[PDB]
Design a protein around this ligand. Structure first.
Ligand SMILES: *[C@@H]1O[C@H](CO)[C@@H](O[C@@H]2O[C@H](CO)[C@@H](O[C@@H]3O[C@H](CO[C@H]4O[C@H](CO)[C@@H](O)[C@H](O)[C@@H]4O)[C@@H](O)[C@H](O[C@H]4O[C@H](CO)[C@@H](O)[C@H](O)[C@@H]4O)[C@@H]3O)[C@H](O)[C@H]2NC(C)=O)[C@H](O)[C@H]1NC(C)=O
Ligand SMILES: *[C@@H]1O[C@H](CO)[C@@H](O[C@@H]2O[C@H](CO)[C@@H](O[C@@H]3O[C@H](CO[C@H]4O[C@H](CO)[C@@H](O)[C@H](O)[C@@H]4O)[C@@H](O)[C@H](O[C@H]4O[C@H](CO)[C@@H](O)[C@H](O)[C@@H]4O)[C@@H]3O)[C@H](O)[C@H]2NC(C)=O)[C@H](O)[C@H]1NC(C)=O
Ligand SMILES: *[C@@H]1O[C@H](CO)[C@@H](O[C@@H]2O[C@H](CO)[C@@H](O[C@@H]3O[C@H](CO[C@H]4O[C@H](CO)[C@@H](O)[C@H](O)[C@@H]4O)[C@@H](O)[C@H](O[C@H]4O[C@H](CO)[C@@H](O)[C@H](O)[C@@H]4O)[C@@H]3O)[C@H](O)[C@H]2NC(C)=O)[C@H](O)[C@H]1NC(C)=O
Ligand SMILES: *[C@@H]1O[C@H](CO)[C@@H](O[C@@H]2O[C@H](CO)[C@@H](O[C@@H]3O[C@H](CO[C@H]4O[C@H](CO)[C@@H](O)[C@H](O)[C@@H]4O)[C@@H](O)[C@H](O)[C@@H]3O)[C@H](O)[C@H]2NC(C)=O)[C@H](O)[C@H]1NC(C)=O
Ligand SMILES: *[C@@H]1O[C@H](CO)[C@@H](O[C@@H]2O[C@H](CO)[C@@H](O[C@@H]3O[C@H](CO[C@H]4O[C@H](CO)[C@@H](O)[C@H](O)[C@@H]4O)[C@@H](O)[C@H](O)[C@@H]3O)[C@H](O)[C@H]2NC(C)=O)[C@H](O)[C@H]1NC(C)=O
Ligand SMILES: *[C@@H]1O[C@H](CO)[C@@H](O[C@@H]2O[C@H](CO)[C@@H](O)[C@H](O)[C@H]2NC(C)=O)[C@H](O)[C@H]1NC(C)=O
Ligand SMILES: *[C@@H]1O[C@H](CO)[C@@H](O[C@@H]2O[C@H](CO)[C@@H](O)[C@H](O)[C@H]2NC(C)=O)[C@H](O)[C@H]1NC(C)=O
Ligand SMILES: *[C@@H]1O[C@H](CO)[C@@H](O[C@@H]2O[C@H](CO)[C@@H](O)[C@H](O)[C@H]2NC(C)=O)[C@H](O)[C@H]1NC(C)=O
Ligand SMILES: *[C@@H]1O[C@H](CO)[C@@H](O[C@@H]2O[C@H](CO)[C@@H](O)[C@H](O)[C@H]2NC(C)=O)[C@H](O)[C@H]1NC(C)=O
Lengths: 56, 197, 148, 49, 50, 49
């Protein structure tokens, strides 16, 4: 996945700071689970679940 | 795009134009108390306001004027718009390679609106010139407000402003970086090689 | 002749009247960024008072008096493969002492670099700052490498 | 120049001189460069009529 | 603090320039030159009415 | 009759001069995003002669 400006084609790697969280979803949004969110945002790491496994 | 900013100002002496300098006529003209007052005030005041707000618009920047040079624009050939060198000294600017075209290729229609020379009218040796004949009727054309020298200083400073980049010690940036900065104002640029330049 | 004088003056005053309404809407009620419209410099607020046959405006603007030099950098390059640029083109990254700060280019407003201040890009320019993820915390004090 | 017309103005004593353009410092578009930059630091308030 | 101290100084000079007690010195600042320009424009409007 | 022609010309030239001032401040000194003010399309910079 990539992010671009609508005025000029400016490819950009999606960062977590490029998104704003809202209260509800839409049927047209990308339907994805948190473990796979790294495929959209390469720099994303689920520090919540990863620490659970590393506690063992 | 072309926009007009000034008009050649004309002032008329009401007494000379109507009475031709005849002493008896001048006394009759006094009965028209507000006739000459309205004509002279309208022409004089409009010309002063015109010259006042034109002079307000003409700013200058010595720092930016120095950068009006071909070496400041790189591949962008601005040779047709920068001012010309002072061929005969005693001045700091000159017309560009486009201003003299628009000022000469256009018709030299000097059919009356000429700010001609007044000091030769009263003591000249030859018969009066068409412009001096108008001056004898009280119609005198003042010099153009947009002086040729102030224009080149004003336009030269503005052209050189595009090369300024806010560097310390007034250093000039490569012009390829001035275009990149103005492109970032449109959309954040992510290209690194800048081949589009 | 009198009708000609009045119609000529009405045309002049109507043009000036339309400009006055624009300045009341854009300089008095609102704050403008259109350069030179509400005076030269940066517009803050305007005031208006009555005057003979018209209005008088008092534009309040800011003018700079002193400038500060900063050793600015174009961007970052982490491990030689991850390039970053600032999220807003009106911001500038600069080095002061040993650490780094972000400031606006219009006003000197120092800011501590946060990871959200950057935008990731596909390549690295040669003028970017070389650093590794191990030392990226020297630039962004809140960065913690959760992998390492 | 207490009074002005075109390229010439007059003084309070009546001396005639040429009117030079008002000196100002133009603004600039801050460049995105790895260079040494000057940023406005201290400010003053001006009122214009 | 500096912005307020600068604003009050400008407004005082503006009022003094409008009154015209020091007309021959107001040209020392182009900020005050706007006052001179405004006064000239108001005078023309007043005189030309009749 | 002459005064009527000249005053009308000064009114026309004043309006065009004020538009020129806006284009110098917004298209030459600055970069504009007002569509159509500095030509159609995306404005980059302007020159004046
Ligand atoms: C991401 O994930 C979500 C969650 O799974 C998906 O959202 C649902 O999408 C399904 C279809 O895939 C929708 O289900 C359809 O709903 C209809 C019933 O009415 C709905 O709406 C009313 C309110 O208006 C609700 O009260 C009600 O419960 C329902 O939700 C039916 O018409 C549909 O039946 C069709 O499918 C069934 C199989 O389920 C077939 O047997 C039928 O023949 C028929 O074709 C269907 O069930 C559902 O409404 C969506 N939910 C929401 C909350 O919007 C997203 O679609 C998915 N997105 C992507 C991009 O993959
Ligand atoms: C941030 O970090 C990056 C990555 O480390 C730096 O980028 C490299 O910087 C080095 C110098 O610091 C550059 O290397 C120089 O490249 C020149 C050309 O190399 C190309 O062409 C040759 C052709 O033979 C190829 O072999 C090569 O692969 C390249 O295609 C050379 O001219 C230079 O030679 C050096 O040595 C000779 C002999 O001593 C000297 O005469 C030269 O002057 C010179 O010192 C040298 O190898 C390199 O190109 C940069 N890019 C890359 C992709 O490697 C950044 O500089 C650094 N920036 C900051 C601000 O820290
Ligand atoms: C918006 O409009 C504002 C004003 O409303 C303009 O701001 C003025 O810009 C001018 C031009 O740069 C500034 O003038 C500079 O001031 C400095 C300090 O003045 C000293 O000298 C004067 C005269 O001797 C004394 O009265 C005063 O006390 C100071 O001692 C000077 O450093 C500048 O250069 C002068 O000196 C050098 C050295 O001799 C010469 O080379 C220069 O030619 C020149 O003589 C210069 O005078 C002025 O200070 C600014 N402020 C004000 C409040 O007027 C903006 O430029 C304009 N901005 C835009 C973006 O349009
Ligand atoms: C930027 O644009 C400039 C304006 O177009 C370019 O200048 C032109 O460059 C060409 C190619 O060098 C010149 O054409 C040659 O000129 C000579 C004769 O030159 C002399 O005579 C002409 C008479 O027309 C006169 O105009 C010149 O000033 C010289 O005195 C001939 O040998 C060739 O046949 C050929 O036509 C243009 O004359 C020249 N114009 C000007 C106004 O200088 C400039 O090269 C461009 N810059 C870059 C970096 O590309
Ligand atoms: C992205 O990386 C680019 C390089 O891949 C950067 O471009 C370089 O920027 C520097 C600093 O402004 C320029 O260095 C100056 O160059 C001139 C000489 O330039 C002329 O000659 C060179 C070849 O020698 C030629 O490439 C240029 O086009 C010019 O014709 C000197 O006066 C200075 O001393 C100084 O060294 C580089 O020239 C420039 N490189 C290139 C290839 O243009 C670019 O700035 C980076 N972008 C960002 C946004 O950071
Ligand atoms: C505007 O500034 C320039 C210099 O940047 C002045 O130009 C010359 O400056 C020297 C030093 O003051 C004068 O002695 C010369 O006589 C000036 N020459 C010319 C041709 O103007 C310019 O006069 C300044 N103008 C104003 C109104 O401050
Ligand atoms: C552009 O800049 C160059 C370099 O300063 C100017 O060329 C100099 O011109 C002066 C006369 O004005 C000569 O005495 C120097 O010898 C020239 N420099 C060189 C390196 O030969 C050039 O005149 C400037 N352009 C304009 C239009 O003023
Ligand atoms: C953390 O670590 C590794 C490298 O140490 C990164 O690389 C691999 O990434 C894929 C996802 O594309 C994982 O499935 C691999 O298991 C990773 N390799 C290893 C050795 O862990 C990885 O992207 C980084 N992030 C995560 C969440 O593992
Ligand atoms: C910004 O400029 C103002 C105005 O000059 C400075 O305030 C003056 O500071 C000097 C030196 O400390 C004092 O003597 C004056 O009394 C202060 N007031 C005025 C009205 O001049 C202020 O210090 C400057 N600020 C910075 C951060 O440099």
């Amino acid at each position: 996945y990539r992010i671009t400006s609508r005025i000029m084609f400016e490819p950009r790697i999606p960062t977590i700071a490029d998104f704003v969280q809202i209260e509800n979803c839409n049927v047209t949004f990308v339907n994805i689970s948190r473990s796979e969110l790294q495929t959209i945002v390469p720099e994303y790491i689920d520090v919540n679940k990863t620490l659970q496994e590393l506690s063992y | 795009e072309y926009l007009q900013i000034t008009s050649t100002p004309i002032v008329v002496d009401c007494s000379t134009y109507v009475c031709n300098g005849n002493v008896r006529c001048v006394e009759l003209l006094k009965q028209y108390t507000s006739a000459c007052k309205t004509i002279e005030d309208a022409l004089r005041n409009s010309a002063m306001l015109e010259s006042a707000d034109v002079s307000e618009m003409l700013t200058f920047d010595k720092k930016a004027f120095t950068l009006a040079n071909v070496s400041s624009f790189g591949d962008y050939n601005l040779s047709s718009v920068i001012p010309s060198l002072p061929r005969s000294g005693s001045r700091v600017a000159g017309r560009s390679a486009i201003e003299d075209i628009l000022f000469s290729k256009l018709v030299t229609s000097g059919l009356g609106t000429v700010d001609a020379d007044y000091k030769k009218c009263t003591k000249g040796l030859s018969i009066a010139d068409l412009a001096c004949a108008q001056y004898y009727n009280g119609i005198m054309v003042l010099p153009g407000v947009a002086d040729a020298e102030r224009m080149a200083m004003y336009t030269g400073s503005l052209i050189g402003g595009i090369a300024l980049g806010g560097l310390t010690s007034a250093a000039s940036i490569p012009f390829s970086l001035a275009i990149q900065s103005r492109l970032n104002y449109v959309a954040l640029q992510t290209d690194v090689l800048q081949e589009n330049q | 002749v009198f009708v000609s004088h009045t119609l000529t003056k009405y045309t002049e005053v109507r043009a000036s009247r339309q400009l006055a309404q624009q300045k009341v809407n854009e300089c008095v009620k609102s704050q403008s960024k259109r350069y030179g419209f509400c005076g030269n410099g940066t517009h803050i607020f305007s005031l208006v008072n009555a005057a003979p046959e018209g209005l008088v405006f008092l534009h309040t603007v800011l003018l700079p008096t002193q400038y500060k030099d900063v050793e600015a950098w174009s961007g970052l390059c982490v491990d030689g493969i991850n390039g970053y640029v600032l999220r807003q083109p009106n911001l500038a990254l600069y080095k002061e002492g040993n650490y780094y700060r972000i400031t606006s280019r219009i006003m000197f407003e120092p800011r501590i670099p946060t990871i959200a201040d950057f935008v990731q890009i596909e390549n690295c320019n040669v003028t970017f700052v070389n650093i590794s993820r191990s030392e990226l915390q020297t630039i962004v004090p809140e960065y913690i490498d959760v992998n390492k | 120049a207490v009074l002005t017309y075109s390229s010439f103005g007059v003084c309070a004593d009546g001396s005639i001189i040429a009117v030079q353009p008002r000196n100002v410092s133009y603004d600039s578009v801050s460049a995105i460069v790895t260079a040494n930059l000057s940023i406005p630091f201290n400010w003053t308030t001006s009122v214009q009529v | 603090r500096i912005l307020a101290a600068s604003f009050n100084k400008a407004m005082t000079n503006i009022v003094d320039a409008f009154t015209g007690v020091n007309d021959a010195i107001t040209q020392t600042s182009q900020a005050l030159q706007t006052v001179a320009t405004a006064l000239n424009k108001i005078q023309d409007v007043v005189n030309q009415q009749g």
